[PDB]
Amino acid sequence: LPPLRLAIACDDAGVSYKEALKAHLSDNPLVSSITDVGVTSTTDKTAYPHVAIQAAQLIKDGKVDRALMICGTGLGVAISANKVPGIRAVTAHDTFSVERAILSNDAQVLCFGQRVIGIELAKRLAGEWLTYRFDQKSASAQKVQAISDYEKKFVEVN
Amino acid sequence: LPPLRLAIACDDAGVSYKEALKAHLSDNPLVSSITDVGVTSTTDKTAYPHVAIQAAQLIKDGKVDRALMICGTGLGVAISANKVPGIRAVTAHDTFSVERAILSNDAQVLCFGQRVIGIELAKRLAGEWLTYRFDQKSASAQKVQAISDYEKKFVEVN
Ligand SMILES: [Cl-]
Ligand SMILES: [Cl-]
Ligand SMILES: [Cl-]
Ligand SMILES: [Cl-]
């Protein structure tokens, strides 16, 4: 499989897992590059939507292929990334969900909750995530299309 | 605490859990009413984004307060609901995340994966979810505001 470009993002509550995941993934041949949008210290209290939207915008703008996002629960980063047009983001902490996030939902964003999941499970799931690639000709693509259809309702004016 | 109006939604892969959850919640004094947007049979192959967006639109339009959504993984329904302006949706399968979905993220939508979670855990989490109420004056409200700020970029033309 070809390697993918990743963005990674966290808030203050996700820093140590982010660092561990970044180290783990920097050795992986399915990762071509990692773009770290921060935060890079627990001292940085930047609110999670800013880091999530920045990382999601890198996907929309063709700079990366997927993003991995970490905060306390991984919920707010997923909500935030889903607000970006054409971006589909999940919070997932089990192997079946992570597979389906790609193969059913074509979700470019995977989010973890540092305060709820353990680091080895998170590393394992992130490694598995990279091995699935969405089939644009699948029956699932027609369901994803209904989401994209809804997104056509909106124009970005600001 | 005052009772809340709920919408409930599922696709074909979420029907039996939806029915069990609806039965469980119809006895709960924190639920004032349940609006079921379907599907109501495993024979109905309506794609999950339609049911999710319909249920999310009930919240946006002041018809219900929250929605519970069930499909195979609960991921696509969450993605879909997050596309609706002002709606914040999560997939959550643990007690800490469900609390924070409300108290941190002010998420009106909770989603479950029938194929990944068990029915008693799902019932328990849905009951707990109703007992938390977001504090609009909290520090978290300022973070949620950053999401709402981003949503201001878009106008709905169709
Ligand atoms: Cl948290
Ligand atoms: Cl797992
Ligand atoms: Cl599934
Ligand atoms: Cl739990």
Residue numbers in the entry:
A (entry chain A), B (entry chain A): 6 to 163
Sentences from the paper on this structure:
Ribose-5-phosphate isomerases catalyze the interconversion of ribulose-5-phosphate and ribose-5-phosphate as an important part of the pentose phosphate pathway. Two types of ribose-5-phosphate isomerases exist, RpiA and RpiB, which share little structural homology and have distinct active sites and mechanisms of action. The C. immitis RpiB contains the canonical open (α,β) Rossman fold, a common fold for proteins that bind nucleotides or nucleotide-like molecules.
A 1.7 Å resolution structure was obtained in which the catalytic base of C. immitis RpiB, Cys76, appears to form a weakly covalent bond with the central carbon of malonic acid with a bond distance of 2.2 Å. The conformation of either of the carboxylates of malonic acid may be reflective of the carboxylate of the covalent adduct formed with iodoacetate. The hydrogen bond with Asp16 is unlikely to occur at neutral pH where both carboxylates are expected to be deprotonated and negatively charged. In contrast, the interaction is well ordered in the pH 5.0 crystal.
